[PDB]
Design an enzyme around this catalytic site. Structure first.
Site, PDB file in Angstrom:
ATOM      1  CG  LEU A  15      -2.383  -0.504   1.086  1.00  0.00           C
ATOM      2  CD1 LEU A  15      -2.558  -1.588   0.026  1.00  0.00           C
ATOM      3  CD2 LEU A  15      -2.943  -0.954   2.412  1.00  0.00           C
ATOM      4  CB  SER A  17       7.328   2.145   1.741  1.00  0.00           C
ATOM      5  CG  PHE A  20       7.858   1.734   9.180  1.00  0.00           C
ATOM      6  CD1 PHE A  20       7.077   0.680   8.711  1.00  0.00           C
ATOM      7  CD2 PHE A  20       7.416   3.033   8.955  1.00  0.00           C
ATOM      8  CE1 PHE A  20       5.905   0.923   7.986  1.00  0.00           C
ATOM      9  CE2 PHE A  20       6.231   3.274   8.249  1.00  0.00           C
ATOM     10  CZ  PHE A  20       5.484   2.217   7.772  1.00  0.00           C
ATOM     11  N   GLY A  21       9.743   0.248   6.985  1.00  0.00           N
ATOM     12  CA  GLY A  21       9.490  -0.841   6.053  1.00  0.00           C
ATOM     13  C   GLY A  21       8.289  -0.559   5.178  1.00  0.00           C
ATOM     14  CG  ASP A 127       5.493  12.071  12.034  1.00  0.00           C
ATOM     15  OD1 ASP A 127       5.558  13.125  11.347  1.00  0.00           O
ATOM     16  OD2 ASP A 127       5.858  10.958  11.611  1.00  0.00           O
TER      17      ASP A 127
END
Ligand SMILES: Cn1ccc2c(-c3nc4c(-n5cc(N[C@@H]6CCOC[C@@H]6N)cn5)ccnc4[nH]3)cccc21
Length: 269
Positions: A15, A17, A20-21, A127
């Protein structure tokens, strides 16, 4: 808290990125139903950051915050959340330019309700940006991405960072100058989020370096009013961008202003 990998089915395509991954769609098998989920999949520091993010999310219970189902340790560490199908707010508004002003006020008011709860709960987000607001429907927003979030100490109103990557264009002057993060610094970030929403997902401080943003704010200058944004909403953005933390409003005051203006637009329509 700890989920069964045998009951989790992941889709191949990603979906999105981050550092973190990846984020992937999946399904978690319950006894009588199946739950559609959004899963953060890790690429020692990242594992600790994911466990800390899960520890914050498990303590939160509000209609305007993404629900965590649990965590799973398999091929990689995974953070499983309830799926908000329409995706990030900034991308949605870039792709749907005909969304009405009343609808933008409705969504940013929902974000202020989630933040009023986070403030009451003594957690700082750190954030808060439009990319981190997810849409359940065109009329229902939820806050996500708790990777930088902190539970405040019982004796302190702020979190002090030891060493400065930071989303600098969303950070208040005291974050930059003193490394101090409070619910009032999240209010500053909420002002930038409001500007992004009324600008249909445009990036703030276009074409400027971080040092050029600091110089602009120090001169007392602030971003202009987006096209079609009501004066009352631009006035609220400017109040969120109060330089001195002490004189800046908290989320109880911000949510009340938005709630009253939203009702005024609703009953006028
Ligand atoms: C393009 N795209 C990107 C995400 C997304 C989704 C979708 N993500 C979801 C989600 N979370 C996604 C993140 N972090 C990502 C990092 C990349 O930037 C966007 C986000 N900040 C955290 N929680 C939680 C619950 N439901 C979600 N649904 C649906 C459809 C499209 C999507």
């Amino acid at each position: 808290v700890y989920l069964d990998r045998k009951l989790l089915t992941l889709e191949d395509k990603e979906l999105g990125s981050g550092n973190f991954g990846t984020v992937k769609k999946g399904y978690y098998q319950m006894k009588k139903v199946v739950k559609t989920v959004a899963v953060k999949i890790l690429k020692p520091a990242l594992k600790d950051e994911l466990l800390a993010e899960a520890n914050v999310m498990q303590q939160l219970d509000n209609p305007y915050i993404v629900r965590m189902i649990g965590i799973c340790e398999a091929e990689s560490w995974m953070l499983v959340m309830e799926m908000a199908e329409l995706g990030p707010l900034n991308k949605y508004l870039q792709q749907n330019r005909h969304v009405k002003d009343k609808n933008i006020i409705e969504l940013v008011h929902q974000v202020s309700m989630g933040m009023k709860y986070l403030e009451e709960s003594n957690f700082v987000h750190r954030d808060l940006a439009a990319r981190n607001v997810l849409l359940v429907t065109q009329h229902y927003a939820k806050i996500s991405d708790f990777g930088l979030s902190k539970a405040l100490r019982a004796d302190e109103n702020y979190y002090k960072a030891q060493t400065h990557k930071w989303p600098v264009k969303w950070y208040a002057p005291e974050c930059i100058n003193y490394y101090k993060f409070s619910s009032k610094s999240d209010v500053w970030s909420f002002g930038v989020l409001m500007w992004e929403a009324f600008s249909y997902g445009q990036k703030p401080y276009r074409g400027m370096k971080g040092s050029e943003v600091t110089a602009m704010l120090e001169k007392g200058e602030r971003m202009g009013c987006p096209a079609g944004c009501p004066r009352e909403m631009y006035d609220l953005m400017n109040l969120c961008w109060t330089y001195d933390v002490e004189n800046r409003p908290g989320f109880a005051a911000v949510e009340l202003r938005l709630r009253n203006y939203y009702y005024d637009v609703v009953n006028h329509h």
